[PDB]
Structure formats: structure tokens, C-alpha cells
Amino acid sequence: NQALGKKAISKMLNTCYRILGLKPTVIFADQIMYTGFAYAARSGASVGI
Amino acid sequence: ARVTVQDAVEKIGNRFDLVLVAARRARQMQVGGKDPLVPEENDKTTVIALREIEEGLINNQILDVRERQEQQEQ
């Protein structure tokens, strides 16, 4: 329930590692990467003048 | 396929000795004179030895007592 700006993501991954273990944090990292890529492409943010 | 060896690590905790144990088990099953105790999923003997350790059926003491048993047999 935040903006997840490259610092909340790191903290969330750290809590997942320090709470659950190693396999769940690996699967979580892969899922985060995939969903981020898909939704960044869907948004279509572009830089104009 | 064992993508993570965390459980095998914690079964016998060194992250350094399990390499030796798995190497010994793989040599036994690859050179000859051994058969896997877990079902073979057409994978290499490396992950088979690691899965054997993960299930808890192979460690240093068990391997040593088995070797003693075969030496006594011959």
C-alpha cells in the first residue's frame, strides 16, 4: 500500500528473504520482474518535448 | 530438478561438506556399483545425489557404514 519506488521494493524483498527463506524469495523476485515488465509496457510511458 | 539447495544445506549444514558428500555419491553412482534410491527423472547423477541428500537417505556416516558393510562382504 505504497508507491514502491525502488526503495520499498528492496525493503519488501528483504522482508520476504528474512521471513520466508530462499526459494520463496527467488520465486517472488521472478514474479515481480515479470509483472513489472508487463505493466510498464502496458502503460506506455514516453518522454516528449 | 533442485533449483535451490537450501534444504540440502540445512540437512547437513556446511555448504562446503555437502559438495564433498554429493561428489562421493555421484562418483559411486557414475563409475559403477551403485543404483539410485530415489526415482530417476532422466537427470544427471549430480542432482540425483543432491535429491538423495535432501530426502535424508545419504550423508557421510551412512556412506561410511555402507562402505564398511561392503568391505566386510568382500
From Swiss-Prot, chain A:
Q: How is it used?
A: Co-administration of salinamide and rifampicin or salinamide and myxopyronin suppresses the emergence of resistance to both antibiotics.
Q: How is it modified after translation?
A: Acetylated on several lysine residues in the presence of glucose.
Sequence intervals crossing the membrane: none
The record describes the protein's role as: DNA-dependent RNA polymerase (RNAP) catalyzes the transcription of DNA into RNA using the four ribonucleoside triphosphates as substrates.
Family, per entry: Belongs to the RNA polymerase beta' chain family.
How does it associate, per the subunit comment? The RNAP catalytic core consists of 2 alpha, 1 beta, 1 beta' and 1 omega subunit. When a sigma factor is associated with the core the holoenzyme is formed, which can initiate transcription. The rRNA transcription and antitermination complex (rrnTAC) consists of RNAP, NusA, NusB, NusE (rpsJ), NusG, SubB, ribosomal protein S4, DNA and precursor rRNA; S4 is more flexible than other subunits.
Q: What is this protein identified as? A: DNA-directed RNA polymerase subunit beta'
This chain's source organism reads Escherichia coli (strain K12)
From Swiss-Prot, chain B:
Which cysteines are cross-linked by disulfides? Answer: none
GO BP, sorted A to Z: bacterial-type flagellum assembly; bacterial-type flagellum-dependent cell motility; cell motility; cellular response to cell envelope stress; DNA-templated transcription initiation; intracellular iron ion homeostasis; nitrate assimilation; protein-containing complex assembly
Which reaction(s) are listed as its catalytic activity?
Answer: RNA(n) + a ribonucleoside 5'-triphosphate = RNA(n+1) + diphosphate
Q: What class of enzyme is it?
A: transferase
* Keyword Transferase in annotation: yes
Which GO CC terms are listed, alphabetically?
cytosol; cytosolic DNA-directed RNA polymerase complex; RNA polymerase complex; transcription elongation factor complex
Keywords (A to Z) from UniProt? DNA-directed RNA polymerase, Nucleotidyltransferase, Transcription, Transferase
Q: What is its EC number?
A: 2.7.7.6
Q: Does Transferase count among this protein's keywords?
A: yes
Please name the GO terms that the record assigns under molecular function: bacterial-type RNA polymerase core enzyme binding; DNA binding; DNA-directed RNA polymerase activity
Function recorded in the entry: Promotes RNA polymerase (RNAP) assembly. Latches the N- and C-terminal regions of the beta' subunit thereby facilitating its interaction with the beta and alpha subunits.
Oligomeric and partner information: The RNAP catalytic core consists of 2 alpha, 1 beta, 1 beta' and 1 omega subunit. When a sigma factor is associated with the core the holoenzyme is formed, which can initiate transcription. The rRNA transcription and antitermination complex (rrnTAC) consists of RNAP, NusA, NusB, NusE (rpsJ), NusG, SubB, ribosomal protein S4, DNA and precursor rRNA; S4 is more flexible than other subunits.
Q: What family name appears in the similarity comment? A: Belongs to the RNA polymerase subunit omega family.
Give the protein name, as stated in the record.
Answer: DNA-directed RNA polymerase subunit omega
In terms of the parent sequence, the fragment covers: 2 to 75 of 91
